[PDB]
Structure 1
């Protein structure tokens, strides 16, 4: 019933009662769905009232509705400008936070003086908010001279008569270091550093973390400052959780530059970290997932902290599907000559579940672990036995996948039970599963008197299969022939044929081509190329770039750390 302009009408009445109530109906039906950008004029007009809730309220509306209407947005301008020149500290600040919450290209020039005289304030709260809107603006459309002039203020803000001011100043200045005026990092000098500590100790929950998620970008000139500071950081069995504790270690773990084997402060440190870490194994569910991967990081650079702490890393039957596997992961990252015993007991009950990716990754570890040590590989043999014997297709498949890598670490050793892994090759409908069996059948065709039919049984159609399975089928048959020419001259032809004449896949056509560029000369240099030695892997279990490892820790608190 056109019930839109009806409200609009009263939204602009004479007195302030009917109007005020209207303002309530505004934001009310504003956040419920209906877009009331058509009321923008009559709303910002009431903004300049003397009410209280309504005051900040219209302000709320303005931030959210200014975007679509920059033109009429100019309505507020002077309001906020003088609003920051109000009495009670509460307003000036709120006035600013609301002010900068708008990005209208021109609001900039009008905030020139505001924020300027805003920084200057006997009350910290105002300064606090100020610094925020400063960085808040520099994030775009902000360069200028009086713009880089406020920068000078946020920097010196370091030594402020309060913790809040310095807290935000820290977080602010840090966020300003995002934009690159080349002079990134800024200054960081002994004076500013130590002075920050005083404003760091008695700052605030999040406030302190700000200086933590920031000071991370700095390395002491020597061990003096390093130890002196790191020491004042150790007491991080903190409250704020995550942010604080994390950042602490985070920034600290990185400070591993002090004279390597000093009087083990470096060690007592690596130790004084583990305890608070295992505690995150009880914080909010999502948090664990954070720490988890984080663990796979720090521990990868320095594992002598989560040494035998493997215990607590045991997944609870109820734990979320992600934290579950994730925990197992790291658990397979520090599995050594000792823990092996229980690591299996762990997995033994982890693969008996029904959680898809759980059981899958589970066994995926059963393999990798056997590769980690000897004692494992042995019992591991039995594990994979009964396991495939569960007759269940998928598990059987994933299991064979691990079997692949197993021989990669122990070739010419456990090939005595292969005849059994073939009994369930009929349940391999996945690229990796199929590929695996093809590699094993090829890689060790010298003993596989069945390699002929099988290997080529799958090739009912050259392509129309994962490029990977092709890349493997290729090298598989190449060895199938090299050891049995008297019955493969026809296969070699049609295998190489389609693999070199109509091969869409470049590398398939590359392997095929380069391959032929062998038998096309001397199968004498074939054995010296195709069947040569093949070095193991050794405790690979997801090993990341050693360099990428040193810098990934250079920022753990962030989400981009879990990688």
Structure 2
């Protein structure tokens, strides 16, 4: 496709540009024809100029040396009276990664910042963040350019300026310490993406510089109020997560109306808000108490969005409505969505721990579930039951005996593991059922999963401690089977439990102590919703939705004691 590139007719060049645009769209290497395109950089055709400049943007990092050869055209194009051409040329020179060009881009960015066009100014903010990605050492004149840019009144430039300021200099707070009032005044009219960025950075500044709820506190809250009704979920979300961290607890409850309203949005947006609501519902349960019904699971939602609603229902669970939710949850148990049932069964287990009054009432429902045929449901039922028998360590013989026989039809490793621990823990409560189950699994040992093999070795040792009279040989066999296993997690069990159990030759005081530590009352597992771990992070970020402080996290501090002088603010 060279010929029509050096062909004089401009239409041929335009066709070649469109076709190479498609070529890049298909992800194909068109870098070889770079010299012909860059030879067309001096075109007077605006469309051809745009296309060749997009080509330069896409293939600048590939043919770096050839682009370096043609820089003079780029500095000449920086003066083109067309604003878009100026921005694109600035982008092109930014994309070039030669360590020597740096001062040229100094002059380019300072001119662009001095440019009257706001578009060029925001692209100059993009240029300075690109430079900081290129050279950290130029941060001084980077900061002075930031100081010049932050003074501009336009919101269009303001959003990009704030984003760049966050990208390069999160620490030099004084620049915003001079312009917080300008930012909050503009935030009424700032564009929605700029709304989000400015709201987050203002959240940082409020956490770092201000003390406990100051008229400036209300000024943010007063101006942020009309945005609760905004069509943008991000504005509503950011405004909502703003009030969670700055607004008084007696006023933050108002945003719950909009958060529920956001749940009618599409799948992805409602996915994030469910994470936000679930985290913030733990600390203030009564806030979403009036909207318990809206959090009821609909069959139309997919698996994980349904799962998130259940977790919120766990937080909203209380003695005044435990009965209402338990009935509704039982309805969801026999849903066709097997994965949702796995979430639902775990959901009822947690609130059962939360409400000690309904321990048996939830328990009575569970045992009926043990009779159903669905392998996943019966597997997930037994583990949820297992958490409940430990917390209420009563001799529930009527419950274990139904559970104990059910093992022979169970295939799931988690469920098969669940059977072994309780019967071992309750070996003295069902002494006529425990001995055969160990005998049953001992012959099949080599076929079970690793996690099950851990508990089956546990079952023997606990059975050996209490009823060695008739199970000693079974323990000997089950120990010897794990002695030559392949998988390694089990080997620690072979090393650990055996030494506590078998070698009475070196029987110290701790060897005597093995019987009590294995038969000790196991404390109730403090079940935690996977959202209290998000209490360390501001609401509505990746670090919120990923639960990890990844590269670039905008971490908030604790609330300081004494207010730094608000008089400087004027």
Q: Quickly name the TM-score band, shorter chain normalised.
A: 0.7 to 0.9
Unaligned runs of 5+ in 1: 1-6, 178-182, 257-264
The alpha-carbon deviation at position 74 of structure 1 amounts to: 2.2
Match of 1:232 among 223, 236, 240: 223
Specify the alignment match of 2:551 in structure 1.
none
2:226 is the counterpart of 1:243 = no
- Preserved CA contact (<8 Å) 2:227 2:239: yes
Report if aligned partners of 2:404, 2:423 keep a CA contact under 8 Å in 1.
no
CA–CA distance in structure 1, aligned partners of residues 518 and 176 of structure 2: 60
Whether 1:8 aligns to 2:9 is: no
Q: Give the alignment partner of residue 136 of structure 2, picking from 120, 128, 143.
A: 143
Equivalents in 2 of 1:307, 1:514: separation in Å?
Answer: 53
Structure 2 SS opposite 1:282: coil
**What's the counterpart of residue 364 of structure 2?**
382
Q: Contact 2:375–2:412 at 8 Å: present in 1 too?
A: no
Contact 2:74 2:89 in 1 (8 A): yes
Cα distance, 1:446–1:381 mapped onto 2, change above 3 Å: same
Runs of 4+ aligned residues of structure 1 deviating over 6 Å after TM superposition are 500-503
Deviations along 1:515-548, one digit per CA (max 9) or x if unpaired, are 227864578644532222233236x25366x6x4
Alignment of 1:366-515 (within 5 A): 366-448=348-430, 449-460=432-443, 462=445, 465-498=448-481, 504-505=488-489, 506-515=491-500
Alignment pair present for 1:549 and 2:534 = yes
Indicate conservation of the 8 Å contact 1:321/1:358, yes or no: yes
Establish whether residue 340 from structure 1 lines up as the match of residue 334 from structure 2: no
User: How far apart, CA to CA, are the structure 1 residues paired with 2:461 and 2:172?
Assistant: 57
Show CA shifts across 1:334-360 (max 9, x none): 211122223223322222222221122
**CA displacement 1:190-242 (0-9 Å, x = unmatched):** 43222211222222121121112323323233232444434433443152623
Q: Is the 8 Å Cα contact of residues 242 and 287 (structure 1) preserved in structure 2?
A: yes
Matched residue, 2:555: none
Cα displacement (A) at 1:94? 3.7
CA–CA separation in structure 2 for the residues paired with 1:230 and 1:103: 44
Alignment partner of 1:342: what SS?
helix
Conserved? CA contact 1:455–1:473, under 8 Å: yes
Q: Is the 8 A contact 1:290 1:562 kept in 2?
A: no
Q: 1:417-441 deviations in whole A, cap 9, x for unaligned?
A: 2221233212222221111100111
Distance 1:185 1:344 in 2: 53
| Residues 80 and 478 (structure 1), Cα distance of their counterparts in 2 relative to 1, 3 Å cut | same
Whether the aligned pair in 1 keeps the contact of 2:67 and 2:96 (CA below 8 Å) is: no
Give 1:292 deviation, angstroms: 1.1
The match for 2:109 among 107, 112, 115 is: 115
1:161 CA drift (Å): 2.5
Contact 1:332 1:541 in 2 (8 A): no
Whether the aligned pair in 2 keeps the contact of 1:77 and 1:107 (CA below 8 Å) is no
Please state whether the residue corresponding to 2:174 is helix, strand or coil.
coil
Root-mean-square deviation (Å) = 2.8
Aligned counterpart for 1:48 among listed residues 28, 42, 49: 42
Contact 1:205–1:239, Cα closer than 8 Å, also in 2: no
Q: Do the aligned partners of residues 529 and 15 (structure 1) sit closer, same or farther apart at CA in structure 2, a change above 3 Å counting?
A: closer
Q: Deviations 1:295-337 (Å, cap 9, x if unpaired)?
A: 2222234434223422211122211222112211221232111
Cα distance in 2 between the residues matched to 1:210 and 1:273: 20
Closer, same or farther in 2 for the Cα pair 1:338/1:136, shift >3 Å? Answer: farther
Higher deviation after alignment, 377-386 or 436-445:
377-386
Note if contact 2:187-2:195 (Cα within 8 Å) is conserved in structure 1: yes
What is the aligned residue count?
Answer: 537
Alignment partner of 1:558 out of 539, 542, 559:
542
In structure 2, the gaps of 5 or more residues are 548-570
Question: Does 2:89 align with 1:95?
Answer: yes
Partner of 1:206: 193
Q: Is the CA contact (8 Å cut-off) linking 1:297 and 1:562 kept in structure 2?
A: no
Match of 1:535 in 2: 523
The structure with the greater share of residues assigned to helix is 2
Structure 1 counterpart of 2:174: 187
Ranked by relative contact order (alpha carbons within 8 Å, sequence separation 6 or more), the top structure is: 2
Change (3 A) 1:106 1:322: farther
Asked if residue 358 in structure 1 is aligned to residue 340 in structure 2, the reply is: yes
Shift of 1:36: 2.0
- State the partner residue of 2:65: 71
Per the alignment, residue 259 of structure 1 pairs with: none
1:242/1:101 CA distance change after superposition, 3 Å: farther
Query: Match of 1:319?
Result: 301
The alpha carbon displacement at 1:98 in A equals 4.5
1-structure distance, mates of 2:343, 2:479: 35
- Deviation (angstroms), 1:21: 3.3
1:55–1:150 distance in 2 versus 1, CA, 3 Å: same
State the alpha-carbon separation in 2 of the partners of residues 344 and 51 from structure 1: 70
- Equivalent in 217, 221, 231 of residue 210 of structure 2: 221
In 2, the alpha carbon distance for the partners of 1:95 and 1:110 equals 13
Counterpart position of 1:260: none
Q: Offset of 1:462 from its aligned partner?
A: 5.0
Once the 2 structures are TM-superposed, how far is the Cα of residue 60 of structure 1 from its aligned partner? Answer: 0.6
